[PDB]
Amino acid sequence: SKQRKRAVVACFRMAPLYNLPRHRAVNLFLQGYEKSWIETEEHYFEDKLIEDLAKPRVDPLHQLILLFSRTALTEKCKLEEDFLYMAYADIMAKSCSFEEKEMEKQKLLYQQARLHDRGAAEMVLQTISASKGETGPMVAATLKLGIAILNGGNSTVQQKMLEYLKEKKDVGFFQSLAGLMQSCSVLDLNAFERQNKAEGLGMKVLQDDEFTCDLFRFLQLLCEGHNSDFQNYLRTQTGNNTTVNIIISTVDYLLRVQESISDFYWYYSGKDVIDEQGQRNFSKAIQVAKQVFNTLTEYIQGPCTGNQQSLAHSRLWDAVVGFLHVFAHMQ
Amino acid sequence: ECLTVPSGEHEQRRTVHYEGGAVSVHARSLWRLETLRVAWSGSHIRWGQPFRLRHVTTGKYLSLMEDKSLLLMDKEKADVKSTAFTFRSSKEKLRKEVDGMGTSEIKYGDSVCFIQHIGTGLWLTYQSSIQRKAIMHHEGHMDDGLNLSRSQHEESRTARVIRSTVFLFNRFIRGLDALSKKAKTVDLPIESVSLSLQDLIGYFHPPDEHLEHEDKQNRLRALKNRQNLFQEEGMINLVLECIDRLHVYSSVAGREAGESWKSILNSLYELLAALIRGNRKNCAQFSGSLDWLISRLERLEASSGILEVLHCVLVESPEALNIIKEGHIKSIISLLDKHGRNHKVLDVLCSLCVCHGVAVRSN
Amino acid sequence: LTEEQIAEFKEAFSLFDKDGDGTITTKELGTVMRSLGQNPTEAELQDMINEVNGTIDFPEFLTMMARKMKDTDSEEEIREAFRVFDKDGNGYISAAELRHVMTNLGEKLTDEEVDEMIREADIDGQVNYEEFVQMMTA
Amino acid sequence: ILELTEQEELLKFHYHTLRLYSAVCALGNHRVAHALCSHVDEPQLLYAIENKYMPGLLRAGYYDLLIDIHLSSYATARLMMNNEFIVPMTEETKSITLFPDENKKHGLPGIGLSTSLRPRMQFSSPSFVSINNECYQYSPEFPLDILKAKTIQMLTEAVQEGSLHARDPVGGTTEFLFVPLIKLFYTLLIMGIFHNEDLKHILQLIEPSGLLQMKLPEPVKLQMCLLLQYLCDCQVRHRIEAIVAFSDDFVAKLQDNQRFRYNEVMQALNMECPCPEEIRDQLLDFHEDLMTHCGIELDLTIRGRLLSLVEKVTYTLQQLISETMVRWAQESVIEDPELVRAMFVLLHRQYDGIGGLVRALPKTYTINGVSVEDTINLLASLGQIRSLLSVEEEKLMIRGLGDIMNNKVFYQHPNLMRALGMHETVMEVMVNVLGPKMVANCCRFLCYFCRISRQNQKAMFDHLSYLLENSSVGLASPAMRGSTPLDVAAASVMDNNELALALREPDLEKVVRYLAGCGLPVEGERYLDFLRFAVFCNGESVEENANVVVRLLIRRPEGLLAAMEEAIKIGNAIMTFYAALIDLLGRCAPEMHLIHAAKGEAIRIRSILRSLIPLGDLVGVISIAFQFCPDHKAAMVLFLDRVYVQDFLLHLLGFLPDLRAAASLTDMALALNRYLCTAVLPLLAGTEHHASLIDSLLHTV
Amino acid sequence: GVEIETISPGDGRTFPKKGQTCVVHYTGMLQNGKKFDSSRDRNKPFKFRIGKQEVIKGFEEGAAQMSLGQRAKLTCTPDVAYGATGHPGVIPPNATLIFDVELLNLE
């Protein structure tokens, strides 16, 4: 290129190994020892921590979960950062052959009864509604806690969340989910090309893809197990004031991911040798489109025909046509 | 985008605009669908049966006066063919007699409701800085498809409380303006004012301490909603001016029925405390008129109310502290040297000394 | 710019600075460079003065003397980094060993850049690094 | 005062006068704290410490006066620096042992090694005498050692008699007994008082391994939770000073090993194999070298040192915290949610110790033993600018920044400035000013700051999206060059191509919305000058900014070419605005990717650049060359050479007045050197211009 | 200006000189019976170099008279004090001082 010439010049230019008077080398050792040595496995402790807390008066873990629910129930118009929350949501998400396989199933079901006895369903279902449309790391940790409890398609938790949303009748939660899907990601048009040119001269694209593979996994797990009442509640939303039809919104996100896939394809339609960046980016978009198709299976799956009709009049079909024009030429 | 009526004191409140954004959540974007029938008025609203609209915050109707314009007029003026509208799903010009709540016709979230006048058949459409005026027109544009969102219950409650309070206090201000220039007679409400005023002190009542955290936060949210709507309709300015026009004689009007003047000033300063005590927005909008309070502060009879309002403004906004200056602070220290030893004066000085976290060193 | 070099530059400036605002006067440039041991032609001195109200100050003085040092650093380091290899002392590096000494760490790119080397390097084959200087340093 | 326990209204008024005295001297007013040392008048406070018969409100009041007059300023100054860990590399620092001499035992964190910087304090004296600049001085003084022994005594007595569970104690309730007393003991512990024979006594009063295991109310154990989090912070300070003590003896042997390798491969006798040795010898910088050495240590003889020391940095106070915070959660169901939120921070923190060390390594930094006094002086100036974040003031800010500007450590250690985060501090003070010469020095410091290293300019680039939101300050002024926030957003891009690419089109939409607000001035050219820095950056105009800027301007650039030709006789702002616009439109569509390839988009853009300023620009070229006159013609050269063979060139031939003014001048003396770089690119009437060039080569004889 | 009572004498003849630093213990109070300063209070003996013109005028005029142990009373005129301005926070505008100075040593 151009600046790579000056870089190759500077590689020879940086001739001193370790003249480095005495302590610049100490400092660079300090940074390298930070990066490649401290980040190790510590994480035996999570289940030990929670079995150390879930011990009987109201239990300590119920004190903690009730603290986060009373923080989420206030009025701030913008959530905090809460490194306390960002630590304990990650702890409560790290802490969740045939007869051995039902034994594994039964201990997972116990490790989620460890939380959702103490209202850990409701603090997730509150901290999503409290952060209005914001896609911060807060909502990321709340979604990972909501997935780490529903992970087997648990049904006490689904019924617990549905009874909660029908009592404290939230338009904020479904408003907040549509507002989360409103951004979430695209794939790209041109930030990849700019990212590639910068990499070529000086020496992301899906910045937060994994938030979307948490969000649509969370929406999958509320309906997995054929909750026809919850599958219908994501559509019609009866008691609340202004219903938010979440299923046409996830159709719209599938359409946006489709068109960004198709207009990544037209970029690669002529060059015909896909790079490493193109593969690492392309599979990273393929997972998100695969995920939202798995959710649209899980809304329809038990034949709740109202949901099939409300999705069949959506703009599903343009997205399916575009996936076929990707598929034929790409295969 | 939404309908509106323009803001306070511009007209005497008769035009029609649009605006989008944050005027939807306010008070003055509210319209009440009255019908022709008294009996079974709460039937379902059907495609093509007549309706009126009513501005819920000033009390006027949407009477298309085909002589002139699209105005807002009263009960005594407005008549049926001038204001009976219809709602369709198409822009075309192709029932009436039922009992029961009838056929559930129109949705809120899924409805493209075109407003069609009956008498002249005109259509509510928009012209071409966003104060985009809506106009009645025989043909219309393509995007006259007004969707409907109902209000909540408690916003309708606060909305009707607004026009009740305004229609009472303009009577009270005009009564003081009549009886203040010349020596009387002229009827002036006192017991209606005292009852309404203790009611509005009860209406902005703070939540308790002894309450569950969920209901306490819900009560505090409804309180902030109420304070915000009375800010954006201009009650603080109105009550402020009434406190001006009362704070002249020291106890002209009938001095058996002008004997409640003392507790009416007590209640007006306590209510002025009540329309501020939570919101930073409202005491921030209030912060222009602070020398007014500090000037009336040394009036020896209402200084409790002035001082509580002053403290509840100075705590909850750091924008108020930058307007306050040396003469005001010297006046408060002189209040301390007139009226013995309060601890409230020292709470005012403590909160005037430090903001939320930022101290102010010259002060 | 090192510990000692920036220390020396600040010491020389602050010793020739009196009032305490960070600005020496205009005619002190040749004085401070000959206190640092540099006596160039007057045209370069006038360019450095006009690159700086009439108060020569700290920032771009640091930057310009950094540039004057990095010129000699360029010469000495492009000498010594090739004095590492080429153990008979001529500057003639063979093309196969140019492939070897070019695919270094840091940059470590593919056959694009070493193809850029071998397409035009002068190869007879022994390659003198002056061709690499005039190619790669623009 | 002791009689006043029953006159309740006088009690409450004097409690609120104590609240006003403690609230006036809030956050470092020493000019007021000397006047309160006149009123409340030191040994009076030492008598209101001691009385076991004062009312509890008056006891908490006089302890908050003792804190907020004499101790609070330096206590907050050291709580600001407790997360910085910077340390010299002297032999006193190398004598730090990590572990008390080959046991399995912890340090018992009353260890006075503590070789970090930790800013020193000054107590000035409150005497009402001479004008000596001691009223605005550091702080009032107080007898430190008297009160240190007094707080030790009061703690020993209060614990040895409150474990008896009396119905007496001093403020009626136990809260007024302990809350102010543990509060003053906490803000006395932070300040680095309590030498080693008092730390051991205090911990024997808390650990025994007591005070910690009683039955306590809520705010007593909230204060105790803060104290105990400080004990964990001293554990972290000991640990990091120990790990730098290890690094000073590891890195010398590592340097010796790699230069031993450099010798053994310098004389490569046999051979490839030594060519990758020269490859690892000659990586990018020392960062890749140290990452390579630690990676080869990660997958010799030196590897035993790290593999042993990491197990010495496994790490029993941790266990007592992780037990007792659980016990307080279990037994005594907790209202006041700040205590629960403070509880589980420590319960989490005692388990995530590796994570605390992860958080605390990118703040520690080493300094050689020469720069120690200058780091103290820089860091005291930085404590002043940290303290001025929460408020006449502008002179303290200016003198702080101007003294920071003149330190050897601000350039010898450019990574220390990001580690202190002081760019974010000076930015936040500048922002807190906005809704003067204060901002004009803050922007000057930030633009100074971006040019001290190239990687520093990245750290300032993570604020440009906000830094353009304030951009409308830069207007008609002399302190608009190099003082606007727009100039900081410009000087955070200038050199880099990575930072040139990384900015986005909504930032450019902010700039072009503020340029399309200027449908009239002087304010237009500064937004244009920022766009000039956006699109170009090294000589080769980067096109993924150039295309977007050209699109947003071809919405509304806003005849006109004759309107620059209008206003010569009017003033300079319009002429400079049109020259900056023609420069900005001149800095796009290069000719490598236009002539070497039909690029499509490059051709299109170049045609849009044709379509405006339609080559009648030559009047605005020539009419300059006789009469402003240096630079507008240069902007037209950069439009005409880039956008738009020698017959068109020979139409344009002049510079005879500039060649004649060799002895006249004096801006002509700076236009003569201006066109000695400008007309060199149009090398690529002939006798007349050759004669004029030879006459200029007589002016260049 | 300064009007001196002898509270306790010293010797009367070892009175200070220019270039000397006197070590006093002043406990100065207002005209109205109220105390404002005391160098008996923080137990630091106040020192000051006569001739360098540090302190207020009447305090330096009175330290010229006292001897090596004399305790006296330096009742200062309000224009010799802080003055019509006063010290902003301690001494009010146009106030009178009644000191109490026990001179101890010289340097």
Side-chain angles (χ1 to χ4, degrees), chain A residues 178-203 205-206 208-248:
Chain A
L180 282 175
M181 295 177 192
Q182 192 63 42
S183 71
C184 272
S185 291
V186 199
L187 161 64
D188 203 3
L189 190 271
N190 52 4
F192 165 66
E193 188 178 5
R194 174 175 285 174
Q195 181 66 38
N196 204 355
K197 211 171 55 171
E199 181 175 6
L201 270 296
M203 280 74 74
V205 178
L206 266 299
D208 204 358
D209 59 339
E210 199 273 336
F211 178 75
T212 66
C213 294
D214 292 333
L215 187 138
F216 293 102
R217 177 68 170 175
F218 184 75
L219 286 184
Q220 171 181 2
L221 264 55
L222 269 59
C223 290
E224 189 185 9
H226 309 292
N227 304 120
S228 68
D229 48 357
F230 210 97
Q231 287 168 357
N232 285 319
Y233 193 67
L234 286 179
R235 184 195 65 241
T236 183
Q237 188 178 348
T238 60
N240 297 322
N241 288 317
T242 61
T243 171
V244 177
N245 196 357
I246 211 160
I247 299 163
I248 303 176

Side-chain angles (χ1 to χ4, degrees), chain D residues 167-200:
Chain D
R167 58 183 291 277
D168 185 77
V170 176
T173 62
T174 59
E175 300 179 359
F176 293 149
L177 177 63
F178 286 104
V179 166
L181 199 272
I182 299 172
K183 181 184 287 183
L184 197 147
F185 167 67
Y186 174 64
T187 64
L188 194 65
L189 186 58
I190 293 170
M191 291 169 65
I193 314 168
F194 295 89
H195 308 289
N196 278 317
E197 285 295 327
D198 294 326
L199 284 168
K200 291 175 72 68

Side-chain angles (χ1 to χ4, degrees), chain A residues 2-3 6-7 10-13 15-43 45-46 48-68 70-71 80-88 90-91 188-191 193-203 205, chain D residues 89 94 243-244 246-255 258-259 262 281-282 289 295 306-307 309-310 313 315 322 326 329-335 337 340-341 344-345 347-349 351-354 357-368 411-415 497-498 501-505 538 540 542-545 548 601:
Chain A
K2 288 185 68 66
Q3 299 298 321
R6 280 82 177 178
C11 288
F12 294 154
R13 179 178 296 273
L17 282 164
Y18 283 101
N19 290 322
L20 268 75
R22 182 74 273 277
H23 62 85
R24 273 86 158 94
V26 175
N27 189 13
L28 268 301
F29 169 72
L30 198 281
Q31 292 298 321
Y33 180 71
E34 156 63 24
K35 183 63 180 68
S36 64
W37 278 97
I38 312 298
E39 300 179 355
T40 59
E41 177 69 22
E42 180 65 28
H43 299 283
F45 72 103
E46 278 85 357
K48 187 178 91 277
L49 199 160
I50 311 301
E51 288 181 354
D52 184 64
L53 287 181
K55 304 296 289 296
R57 289 176 182 173
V58 173
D59 302 333
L61 197 68
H62 205 289
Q63 299 294 101
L64 192 149
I65 294 171
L66 197 144
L67 180 273
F68 291 136
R70 288 185 298 169
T71 292
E80 304 183 359
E81 292 294 326
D82 280 329
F83 70 101
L84 182 69
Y85 189 86
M86 299 295 296
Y88 279 99
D90 286 333
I91 285 175
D188 203 3
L189 190 271
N190 52 4
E193 188 178 5
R194 174 175 285 174
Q195 181 66 38
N196 204 355
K197 211 171 55 171
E199 181 175 6
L201 270 296
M203 280 74 74
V205 178
Chain D
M89 53 161 285
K94 196 177 288 188
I243 212 159
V244 179
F246 175 73
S247 69
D248 269 328
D249 290 330
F250 190 86
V251 171
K253 292 176 183 178
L254 201 281
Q255 291 180 357
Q258 285 194 2
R259 286 182 63 249
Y262 179 71
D281 188 1
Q282 203 51 252
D289 287 333
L306 275 177
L307 193 61
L309 188 273
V310 172
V313 187
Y315 297 103
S322 184
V326 178
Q330 287 180 358
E331 67 185 6
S332 71
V333 174
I334 315 167
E335 293 182 353
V340 176
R341 183 171 177 86
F344 290 108
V345 167
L347 184 63
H348 172 263
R349 180 171 174 170
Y351 283 158
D352 190 71
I354 299 296
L357 197 275
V358 169
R359 288 175 56 196
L361 275 177
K363 290 177 179 180
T364 174
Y365 190 86
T366 57
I367 287 98
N368 51 4
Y411 312 101
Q412 288 181 353
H413 306 89
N415 303 322
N497 198 356
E498 179 176 359
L501 290 170
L503 61 87
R504 293 179 183 270
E505 68 270 13
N538 265 317
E540 187 70 26
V542 291
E543 62 270 12
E544 287 295 327
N545 297 119
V548 181
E601 55 189 0

Side-chain angles (χ1 to χ4, degrees), chain D residues 261-268 273-279 281-282 289 295 300-311:
Chain D
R261 293 177 182 176
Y262 179 71
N263 194 0
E264 285 186 350
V265 180
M266 185 66 201
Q267 297 176 358
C273 292
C275 303
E277 305 295 327
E278 294 173 352
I279 286 167
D281 188 1
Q282 203 51 252
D289 287 333
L300 285 169
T301 63
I302 302 175
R303 302 180 181 183
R305 290 178 181 90
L306 275 177
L307 193 61
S308 61
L309 188 273
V310 172
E311 296 299 323

Side-chain angles (χ1 to χ4, degrees), chain B residues 222-262:
Chain B
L223 185 69
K224 284 185 182 178
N225 194 1
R226 293 187 175 101
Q227 289 174 357
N228 209 164
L229 295 181
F230 285 18
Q231 170 64 48
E232 290 163 348
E233 287 291 324
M235 300 305 106
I236 293 95
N237 197 358
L238 172 140
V239 173
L240 209 71
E241 296 297 325
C242 179
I243 289 166
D244 282 328
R245 290 183 178 93
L246 282 169
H247 211 188
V248 178
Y249 72 110
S250 68
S251 183
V252 181
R255 294 182 184 93
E256 182 69 28
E259 188 264 330
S260 298
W261 167 76
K262 195 263 188 300

Side-chain angles (χ1 to χ4, degrees), chain D residues 56-67:
Chain D
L57 303 179
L58 261 280
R59 190 163 186 262
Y62 277 110
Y63 285 12
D64 289 334
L65 274 177
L66 197 142
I67 294 168

Side-chain angles (χ1 to χ4, degrees), chain B residues 109-276:
Chain B
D110 298 334
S111 290
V112 181
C113 296
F114 296 92
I115 295 176
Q116 180 178 2
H117 183 71
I118 288 172
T120 58
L122 296 167
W123 294 83
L124 192 70
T125 189
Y126 58 96
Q127 292 181 357
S128 67
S129 66
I130 300 167
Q131 196 177 2
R132 182 184 298 173
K133 184 170 171 64
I135 52 172
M136 297 299 286
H137 186 73
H138 290 284
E139 298 89 6
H141 291 283
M142 190 65 73
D143 288 330
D144 301 330
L146 285 170
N147 198 1
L148 296 170
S149 63
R150 56 179 290 168
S151 70
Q152 297 182 355
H153 296 282
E154 67 98 20
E155 293 182 354
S156 177
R157 174 64 181 169
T158 62
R160 168 70 174 165
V161 167
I162 290 166
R163 61 171 169 181
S164 174
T165 305
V166 169
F167 185 71
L168 190 145
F169 271 93
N170 283 322
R171 289 184 180 180
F172 187 73
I173 288 172
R174 289 175 181 175
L176 265 69
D177 289 332
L179 303 185
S180 61
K181 294 182 175 66
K182 84 286 296 174
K184 293 180 181 181
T185 64
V186 178
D187 284 331
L188 181 141
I190 290 298
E191 65 272 16
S192 179
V193 176
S194 68
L195 188 61
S196 174
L197 204 59
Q198 289 180 356
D199 198 1
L200 281 174
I201 296 171
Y203 192 65
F204 290 101
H205 188 67
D208 301 333
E209 294 293 328
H210 295 284
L211 190 58
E212 289 181 351
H213 186 274
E214 184 266 330
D215 289 331
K216 186 179 75 174
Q217 292 308 117
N218 287 314
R219 191 172 305 276
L220 179 55
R221 187 179 298 115
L223 185 69
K224 284 185 182 178
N225 194 1
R226 293 187 175 101
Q227 289 174 357
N228 209 164
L229 295 181
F230 285 18
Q231 170 64 48
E232 290 163 348
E233 287 291 324
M235 300 305 106
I236 293 95
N237 197 358
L238 172 140
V239 173
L240 209 71
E241 296 297 325
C242 179
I243 289 166
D244 282 328
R245 290 183 178 93
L246 282 169
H247 211 188
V248 178
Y249 72 110
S250 68
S251 183
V252 181
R255 294 182 184 93
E256 182 69 28
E259 188 264 330
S260 298
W261 167 76
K262 195 263 188 300
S263 76
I264 286 171
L265 271 177
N266 208 164
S267 295
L268 283 175
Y269 283 113
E270 184 167 356
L271 183 141
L272 184 59
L275 271 71
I276 273 89

